[PDB]
Amino acid sequence: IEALPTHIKAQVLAEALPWLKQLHGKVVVVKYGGNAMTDDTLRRAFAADMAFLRNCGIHPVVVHGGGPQITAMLRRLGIEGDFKGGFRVTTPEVLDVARMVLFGQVGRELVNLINAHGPYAVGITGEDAQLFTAVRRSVTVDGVATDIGLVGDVDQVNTAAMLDLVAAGRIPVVSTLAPDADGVVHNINADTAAAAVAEALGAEKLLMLTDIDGLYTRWPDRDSLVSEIDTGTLAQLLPTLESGMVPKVEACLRAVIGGVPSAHIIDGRVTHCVLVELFTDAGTGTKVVRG
Amino acid sequence: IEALPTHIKAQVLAEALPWLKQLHGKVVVVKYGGNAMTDDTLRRAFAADMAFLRNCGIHPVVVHGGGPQITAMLRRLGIEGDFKGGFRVTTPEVLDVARMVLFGQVGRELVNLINAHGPYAVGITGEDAQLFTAVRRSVTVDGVATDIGLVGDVDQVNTAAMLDLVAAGRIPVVSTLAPDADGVVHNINADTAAAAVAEALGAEKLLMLTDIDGLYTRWPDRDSLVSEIDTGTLAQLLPTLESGMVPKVEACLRAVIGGVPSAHIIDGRVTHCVLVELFTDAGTGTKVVRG
Amino acid sequence: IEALPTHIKAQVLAEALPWLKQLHGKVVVVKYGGNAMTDDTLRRAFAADMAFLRNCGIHPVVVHGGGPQITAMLRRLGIEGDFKGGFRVTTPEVLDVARMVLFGQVGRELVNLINAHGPYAVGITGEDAQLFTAVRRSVTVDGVATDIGLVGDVDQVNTAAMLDLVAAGRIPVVSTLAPDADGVVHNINADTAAAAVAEALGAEKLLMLTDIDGLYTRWPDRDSLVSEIDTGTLAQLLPTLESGMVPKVEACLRAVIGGVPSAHIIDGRVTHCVLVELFTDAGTGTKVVRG
Amino acid sequence: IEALPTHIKAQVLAEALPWLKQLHGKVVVVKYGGNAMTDDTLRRAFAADMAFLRNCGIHPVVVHGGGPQITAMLRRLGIEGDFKGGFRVTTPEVLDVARMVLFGQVGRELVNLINAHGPYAVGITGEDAQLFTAVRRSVTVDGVATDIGLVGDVDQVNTAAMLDLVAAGRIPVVSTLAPDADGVVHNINADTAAAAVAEALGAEKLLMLTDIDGLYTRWPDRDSLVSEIDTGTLAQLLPTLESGMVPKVEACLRAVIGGVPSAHIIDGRVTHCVLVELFTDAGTGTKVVRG
Amino acid sequence: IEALPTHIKAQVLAEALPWLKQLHGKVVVVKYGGNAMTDDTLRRAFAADMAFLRNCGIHPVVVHGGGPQITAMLRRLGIEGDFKGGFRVTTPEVLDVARMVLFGQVGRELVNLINAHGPYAVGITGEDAQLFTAVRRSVTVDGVATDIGLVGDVDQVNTAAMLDLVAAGRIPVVSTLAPDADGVVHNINADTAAAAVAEALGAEKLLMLTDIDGLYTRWPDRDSLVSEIDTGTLAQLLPTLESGMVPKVEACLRAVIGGVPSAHIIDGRVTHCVLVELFTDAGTGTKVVRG
Amino acid sequence: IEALPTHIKAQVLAEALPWLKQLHGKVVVVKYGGNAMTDDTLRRAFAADMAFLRNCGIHPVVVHGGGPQITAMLRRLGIEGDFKGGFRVTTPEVLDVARMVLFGQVGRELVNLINAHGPYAVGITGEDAQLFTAVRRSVTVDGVATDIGLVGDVDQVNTAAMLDLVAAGRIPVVSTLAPDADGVVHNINADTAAAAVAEALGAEKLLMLTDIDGLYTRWPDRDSLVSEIDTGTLAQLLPTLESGMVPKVEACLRAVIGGVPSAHIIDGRVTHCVLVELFTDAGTGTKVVRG
């Protein structure tokens, strides 16, 4: 990367300026998962990018998933799952494992990675300082709503305490578990939780790291890939997308309808995708705006 | 507890006043472990007592252990241990389990218990916001110092950031793991870590919840139980005590020699032992002062 | 008080917790008078209790009377009183004496008693920093309203400056005198003044120390004593009570109708009645709520 | 005062500027007593002048005496005095009267006068918020030191709390009574107390209102009146002055030797003497500087 | 000024008190121009008066003109003017000169004069920190509106940033130039700009230094001079006044109709006219109030 | 700049991170002059770069020169210069012009350019709020020290007030003129003034924009260009450099010897030289460190 003339290095940096101005002092919530979480190079770059935002006076908040790591731990422990439709039932036992994996393993890795750059990252769940609560959610399988245990949606968010935490200079790394109104901790889908945090904190952007180039309208025709789409158009496209894309699209819809100026589906397999998406006009992602 | 005349209920409360004055606005570090951690009634009372201190303008900091829960998880996972002397070698694998159990299971229970009373508890390790670091420690077995893996002592403490956290109204619940100067996370003995936190934070008292009435000089003669002892006298008694008492005594010595006005060995099998030890003159504990 | 087992001392303290939570950070206004003011043991306990609240992060405000001490000083000075009905006419001369006794004698004793525990108490009237004003009040005697000199009701309260004073850590000890809109100082009934201060400061509780077990509906049938009563029921009972109880009941009505969550008539002859009433479920007082 | 040309009114005001700059943001302690306290016109002007300083961003602190009012109250109460030399013995009874007169009568008048201009004045003694303490003082009569009861000198001053009070915009009006280290309240000579407050608060000036034109070296030769004198020269003149001047001179010596840049003996019989002394070059007072 | 008795010096100072109270903590905007700007004695007195206000806890803001100095610089540079009616057309060249003269010459003199008394003055235009913007204004000549170049009126004012600047202790000295919404800097009439600043900052008074005794209704009958007039009466007098008085009267109208409690036309040829107008009842000015 | 692959745009941005961390929250003083000031493209890029730093939480302070613009204005005004050696004598007349040009023309252009990006820039001299003073400097011509009028060096700097100004979010744009201890304004060489400001403000870096690639040791051998040099080595090279380089080298020496971690001589003819020098490893400048 040294053969590149220095007067073009300048123009790349200078071209970051309008986005540095837009985001200065703003909250950016980032859903982190997928291959950006499993490969060491993409991992280290993601943590560096969070340090970058933070050393620009931007306020990143990281929400992470970890579905496959939970499954692997359950298999190691010999915990036999029950399944309704495609969903595992989250017994009290499965939740203890889920919480222990997400908060005590997956979150820890990211906190330490980020903290290689400074005392920034702080790991938390909804349990800590009552930062957010959960409401038990049902799923509908083959047409009927049904209970799958201690799984929920974000209910209320302690917006004040959370913003104090970021104004203090910290990068929260959120593991999506929180108590319901009776103190019973539930596990929350990380995609939906990121949308709820973005809306509650008045975030400027929601970023959804996924393992795809971007949203295709008629997958897999290559030319169906789009750069920007409004909520109304995307809401009506929702029942046609592949299974994996629906949670990310439902998140983007709830966020931007909830007032978040834009939500982005970006390719987590690209090194420094966050830097590319926020400070460059040449991202592969797809931007969701209201309309 | 209602047949008791109300004019004696008054005198019990009024008799708390000199200790409310002594501790108002002060840090109190509490090592929590033993039966006070395993029985639901003692557990719930301990969390209530932390809420009590906090609703008195006292600043509790909780450090917790969890040795037996780590062992049980290692056995569930089929992780064969290596043992030098009586010590398990903490491989990278054992540490991941230890961190996951201590921070993602044991700490979570206490945070949620305390938080039943309000948004007080916040769980953390040395990894979060670089709150404290670890230095790898050796043990000496049968006369020779020897390496037992990723085990250490508290190195430096981010005293400023930690006191900000408690001035903000929070009750930190500390899981004793922290990175060394290279970012490699170690597990720290909870007793020694509590002493280091008490000294670093300028605590007024260190409380060590143990499963014994108090320090016996010639166990098990019943009349060898003492109420108060100075560091010099106790340092010379150290090589005679039962195996389980040495870590708690070494902690009390390091703390009070380190400037902490008093350290207390109190019986964690007594419901509300904290309330008894701090606000009553009739505790069964033993108080350590300098001299 | 030492023969009492220590595990019951614990339960008494632990049972204070729900009230410590309710009152933490809250204003509690206390009308202090009667035998709680004349006997040294009850006096010293009252001052200790104010120190207690304050060392719990509660914000006590004390309003005191002193009718009999004024009378005794007037007799010592040979000031002949004029009387309309049962009321002394407060000439400019009587007011100077009243102010001098209440502020320069009675208030001083309480400030010094409280201050034996720390730099807490601060004595004041409405004159100081224009903290509250008075409006001249009439009385009605044998059916007709009539002027009895420089006697009034609290008019406006400098709520902001007063709360600054308590947020600063101080325990105001208020002598009920204040200027009217022309700067002419009036003496205010201490019971009514306490109700006005409680309402103006947004107090959580008003406590009225009196020399009786509590409110009797049909004095003196012993079983007419009640524990709790709403404002509507008590307002209609008002014209039947003994002469001495009316000012305390009118105060409780004005306070709780004014928004104060509860007002309490408690027995000032009981040592530590404040501690008993606030932190115990076994008080002899009577609680007034709205309805 | 209207026949005076307006271009000379201008020059008088403009000539205040160098002293407005010198005193802006500074503490000025003022001993108030004498005829400036007994005549209504001089009284009202003094209170106006305190409002003036305060509406210039200057921080006045007022210390007042009241010897003759105490005597008159003792005579009204039939309290027979005991006298050693020329000193009344301050029994516990005499002190209660002294405190009640100074704090509950004399201080009240000044607070209300000042407060006619705004919410400025606040009355206090050493008892309030433990603002200052007293140490019992002896007197020497006919050559021998001797006890005259509960009379003392200022011991320690809560400098921090006092300056908070003035930074908050208040004009403390101090009645010179304070507890000793055992809580026993003593009465303090107002002149000496003013010097101790000036030194403790880092005052820029001490003003001593007296009933004389200024310090005469050889009273009563008219030409012995001086405008300025250093501490060394005045210390050696001390044993020759008239009885009434010694307390004021001892105060000026202790203050300016204690670090106070200048102390002034000014004529309290002149209307607005404070305004004249501080903002004009034509004062009749005498200025004391170190040397 | 020394033959004047000192008890009349006192009364002049004491008579400032009601105006010191009215203006304490308030913004006073002062249009400075005319002979008060050209003569060294009047200049130095004006700067002293600004120091005076500031050493009274008053917040002066100075707006200055400089028409004749611009003309003289244009003549020195050989810049030929174009004139429509009586107005010079402000080409880009004339503006550069105007800005350079007003900000780099005329403002500098006043900043240094004021700063002889302390670090008070700070020079600024609308360009600095975007403190205010301009909107291009037309003039009407011989009946028709017409463009005269880069001349405008104050558009929006950064009220927050400006008050921060004065709360910080500074005396802004404003040169009336500001960018329009496209960043193109315009020159603003100093009289109108002073009115807009007074209204935007919530000033207590606007002072307009002019070279006349005050407003005459039927110039030049001597007895037509008035002391006070309401906006309605003065608005209807507007089309009759001499050419030079209209900008000052239009300013006073816009200010006081805009909410400014009073605007004053005062004689800038009088030494210390500001001190005379604000702190004395004997000013020659004319006061404008709403009605 | 769009044909460049986006995964290399990423690496350029990511490579800024170590310098974003080093400079976050730090003062950077920038001497701005030369062709970076005369060409519109380089001008606009410089202002953008100042906005960039500021939108990264870096604190730029800009010091500007303007020698040639002063000369041109003097020629336009027909002001005949006097010359001793190669130096113009700065008469009171030349200074008024210099101040008017630097502060009222050259500084204004940069403030408005920067402010196109936000309310950042604020123009000032040493005169404003007494921000810094000047001491008259002599020059030595043909071997003898000699007076050349109102020219000086920075004397003292109001470090506190200046850092308040930058902590408030502002970008000071400094015109190098300041009063001496008698209030007489002098003109200061902009290069030396930048070094004095960097040292006084505890800057992390001093940047000197010049019209050369960097420091050559044996100009003009191309291979004598160096990347980094210590103060000791450069001090001994000083008497050999071309005339134009000495002021920039003397500045770098005074700054880094004064404690500034590094000073940089960078090529002001390169677009975005600031971005290149601070956030890239490929700058053409020369870095000066202590040794």
Ligand SMILES: COC(=O)c1cc(O)cc(C(=O)OC)c1
């Ligand atoms: C020292 O860093 C912090 O302030 C910190 C650290 C944490 O681990 C959690 C929290 C938190 O949840 O605040 C409500 C705050």
Ligand SMILES: COC(=O)c1cc(O)cc(C(=O)OC)c1
């Ligand atoms: C040093 O303690 C204080 O702040 C204090 C003391 C007093 O005696 C009165 C007041 C008061 O009335 O504040 C408005 C405040």
Ligand SMILES: COC(=O)c1cc(O)cc(C(=O)OC)c1
């Ligand atoms: C050090 O004084 C200042 O704070 C100061 C000085 C200036 O010359 C301008 C400003 C300003 O415009 O603030 C927005 C502030």
